Write a structure and sequence with these properties.
Chain A: Interacts directly with Csy2; part of the Csy ribonucleoprotein complex with a probable stoichiometry of Csy1(1),Csy2(1),Csy3(6),Cas6/Csy4(1)-crRNA(1). A Csy3(6),Cas6/Csy4(1)-crRNA(1) subcomplex is also formed. The structure is cut from a larger assembly and holds chains A (108 residues), B (306 residues) and C (335 residues). By secondary structure, chain A is mostly helical. Helix content of chain A is 41%, strand content 6%. By secondary structure, chain C is an alpha+beta fold. The radius of gyration of chain C is 23 Å and the shape is globular. Classes of the chains: A mainly alpha (108), B alpha+beta (306), C alpha+beta (335). At the B-C interface, loops of B face strand 17 of C. Chain C binds one RNA strand of 60 nucleotides through strand 1, strand 4, strand 5, helix 5 and strand 18.
Chain lengths: 108, 306, 335
RNA sequence: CUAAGAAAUUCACGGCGGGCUUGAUGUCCGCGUCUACCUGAUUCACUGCCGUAUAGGCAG
């Protein structure tokens, strides 16, 4: 998204009690929906905003410069199969490779 | 799935700019899905006109030359790019790194259908080579062999042999023809039992970790390297679903509005490069499609191998 | 309403290969099948600093302190051998065919309207102005980019290959054919009709192009230079890397393609250049200036929408340019 | 119906200044290589003669 709005992500990303703040606002709890509040309806509005970051916004679409590939079904016909770039996968394999190449436990 | 009644051999194909980025995790030889899509486009374009069903591919890869370059003072490599045209103002466009490579593969495509007795085998092989000469394999132009020493013609081996001696003889005559290469097969049960052994050693183990362990070279304390059987590589083994399937005219900016779309993501399996006489059966080693679309799992492999 | 397709894509017709270069002697170029290749080797160059000062450091102290610290490089060169005065560049060309149908289109209404428009163009006047200029750029050796600019005699041989052998042989003199005029010759018209039959039909047409350039003994030839970023560390880094397919220098394929598409003489600015390459918003990256801007109605996109959607067929030169874009290929489409 | 579909890296360059690498040295004792065979498969398409002949025949 917009990089100047990264303060909301660093606001929600903390571990304040034992878990994530978005993980708190996603579950209905007595500690949740009241701390960022003096009235209940604006708290409901703020939480209904804050939980929607994990959902796709808009109609599903891939651009003309995105890739999409016919796959032959066994009977007949095709599916369109637009793939994406898995950034959690690349980041996890990147952390493992950086551990195996520059880690102190391997350099020893 | 289906045993091919014939096994047609496309000869050494020169491909000049293949997509060397096989997956978001692997560079190198292009994906097996490219070759299966190539033979399905061949089926789509002449497999209807000749009353056949081209199915399965044997990948050989005689010669591979990637357009990479090692920068000075680093262990890893980078890619040599191409110069894009300018925008409408004269500034340079933002470059997207695409890896190129020069291949030399031979394709063993298995053909079966009622068109075998309608036509001579040499005529249908000649027609499928003339159709292959105007296509592209993984994004690269198929160089059609002009003014060289002698063009390599095709050979459609009828798999139904009069004898087992005749079958082994004609198989050996093919294996001599595609010998300097290295056939690529999928070995997933080996990855599964390696997952089993590594989870015996240490629990909660992913098989991404097992694929990483079978990819790398790793030393052991008494220093010696740990042996690997053969040339094991990681390959993209098809796709896995993310979104539920949508209706054909529902997704915005699709490639087609008659075909349902589904957002997918890669699946990284394990392949192996063997010398072609090691398999001792060329009726297998062909890469088929396995869809089962109700759970995603649009994937390719080679059954009947081991 | 016949809205535009959101995904448009055309396959590149006129597909060339990597142009290998070799070397040998003129007047035995007929037996030039076993000529050795031109190899890319390193050489070390140095010199002082020549470019302009940044106007605040013009003092003689740091000027003389700068010319006592020359820069040190390791460049690649490709030289002819010292006993050979001919450069032999050879590549293969495929004319694919089916030059109107898009490889991807959302709307079927846009698809058959565009196919009807392309068919209207080709039965009005076939590929005989475009294929004439493509045969010109194969005739005069414009694909020899800097290897042409001082040659004593360039001779181009184009042999149409059948299933296994040479179906028809051409032979040209690329210095008699200029780099800015598209005239009429007999063999040029025969080659243009072969490229026309390729572009119209469904099968591919294969051509082998050989270009001999008589430069001189041991002079420098100029293959493509590889675009690399993230170069490394200055003790081992190379400054200029030439292209080499298999230990042999070579011009890139897309450089040959950009030479063959230099047919566009219909851009609205004056032709002090002559022909330029065919691009949407036709831009010359050596000139750094994008002709056919969208503010004038002479770029590719608006011409195609006026030709297909609202049926304003433009001048015949501009639809020549539009069909040249369609043979060029491309990826077009809004969000 | 292929992580599908598209792409100009390029213009110029002085790497030269100079030099002592030296001395000294035990390779060395010993040794069983035997055994047995068809180069011949038409393997010398030769030499000459009649005939203008290369066309065709004849001799040894």
């Amino acid at each position: 998204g917009n990089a100047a709005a990264l303060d909301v992500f660093k606001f929600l990303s903390l571990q304040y009690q034992g878990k994530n703040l978005l993980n708190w606002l996603t579950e209905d709890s007595a500690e949740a929906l009241q701390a960022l509040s003096d009235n209940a309806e604006q708290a409901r509005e703020w939480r209904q905003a804050f939980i929607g970051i994990t959902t796709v916004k808009g109609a599903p679409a891939s651009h003309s410069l995105a890739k999409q590939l016919y796959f032959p079904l066994p009977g007949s016909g095709y599916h369109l199969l637009a793939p994406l770039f898995p950034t959690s996968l690349v980041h996890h394999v990147h952390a493992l490779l950086r551990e195996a190449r520059f880690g102190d436990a391997a350099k020893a | 799935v289906t045993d091919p009644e014939a096994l047609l051999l496309l000869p050494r194909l020169s491909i000049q700019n293949a997509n060397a980025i096989s997956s978001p995790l692997t560079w190198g030889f292009p994906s097996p899905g490219a070759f299966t899509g190539f033979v399905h486009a061949l089926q789509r374009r002449v497999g209807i006109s000749l009353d056949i069903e081209l199915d399965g591919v044997g990948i050989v890869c005689h010669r591979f030359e990637a357009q990479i370059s090692q920068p000075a003072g680093k262990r890893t490599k980078v890619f040599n790019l191409t110069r894009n045209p300018l925008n409408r103002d004269g500034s340079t466009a933002a470059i997207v790194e695409e890896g190129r490579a020069h291949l030399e593969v031979s394709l063993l495509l298995g053909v079966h259908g009622d068109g075998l007795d309608d036509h001579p085998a040499q005529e249908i092989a000649r027609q499928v080579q003339e159709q292959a000469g105007a296509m592209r394999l993984a994004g690269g132009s198929i160089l059609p062999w002009c003014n060289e020493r002698f063009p390599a013609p095709n050979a459609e081996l009828l798999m139904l042999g009069g004898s087992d001696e005749q079958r082994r003889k004609n198989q050996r005559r093919l294996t001599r023809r595609l010998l300097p290469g290295f056939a690529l097969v999928s070995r997933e049960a080996l990855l599964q039992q390696h997952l089993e052994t590594l989870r015996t050693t240490l629990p909660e183990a992913t098989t991404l970790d097992a694929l990483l362990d079978l990819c790398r070279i790793n030393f052991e304390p008494p220093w010696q390297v740990r042996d690997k059987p053969g040339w094991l590589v990681p390959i993209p083994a098809g796709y896995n679903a993310l979104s539920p399937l949508y209706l054909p005219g529902e997704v915005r900016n699709a490639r087609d509005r008659e075909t349902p779309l589904r957002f997918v993501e890669n699946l990284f399996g394990l392949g192996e490069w063997l010398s072609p006489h090691r398999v001792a059966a060329l009726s297998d080693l062909l890469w088929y499609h396995h869809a089962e679309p109700d759970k995603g799992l649009y994937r390719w492999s080679t059954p009947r191998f081991v | 309403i016949l809205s535009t397709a959101s995904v448009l894509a055309f396959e590149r017709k006129l597909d060339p290969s990597d142009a290998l270069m070799s070397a040998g002697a003129w007047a035995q170029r007929d037996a030039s099948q076993e000529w050795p290749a031109v190899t890319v080797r390193e050489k070390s160059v140095r010199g002082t600093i020549s470019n302009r000062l940044k106007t605040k450091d013009r003092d003689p102290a740091k000027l003389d302190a700068s010319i006592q610290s020359p820069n040190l490089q390791t460049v690649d060169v490709a030289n002819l051998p010292s006993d050979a005065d001919t450069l032999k560049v050879r590549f293969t060309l495929r004319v694919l065919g089916g030059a109107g149908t898009p490889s991807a289109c959302n709307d079927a209404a846009y698809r058959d309207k565009l196919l009807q428009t392309v068919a209207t163009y080709v039965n009005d006047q076939g590929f005989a102005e475009l294929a004439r200029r493509y045969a010109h750029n194969l005739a005069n050796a414009r694909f020899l980019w800097r290897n042409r600019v001082g040659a004593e005699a360039v001779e181009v041989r184009i042999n149409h290959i059948r299933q296994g052998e040479v179906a028809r042989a051409w032979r040209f003199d690329a210095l008699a054919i200029g780099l800015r005029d598209f005239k009429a010759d007999a063999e040029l018209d025969a080659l243009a009709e072969l490229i026309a039959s390729g572009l119209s039909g469904s099968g591919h047409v294969l051509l082998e192009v050989v270009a001999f350039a008589r430069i001189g003994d041991g002079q420098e030839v100029f293959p493509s230079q590889e675009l690399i970023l993230d170069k490394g560390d200055k003790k081992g880094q190379k400054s200029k890397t030439l292209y080499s397919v298999r230990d042999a220098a070579a011009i890139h394929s897309q450089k040959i393609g950009n030479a063959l598409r230099t047919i566009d003489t219909w851009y609205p600015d004056e032709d002090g250049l002559g022909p330029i390459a065919v691009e949407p918003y036709g831009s010359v990256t050596s000139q750094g200036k994008a002709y056919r801007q969208p503010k004038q109605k002479l770029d590719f996109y608006t011409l195609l929408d006026n030709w297909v959607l609202r049926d304003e067929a433009p001048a015949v030169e501009q639809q020549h340019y539009v069909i040249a874009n369609l043979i060029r290929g491309g990826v077009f489409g809004e969000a």
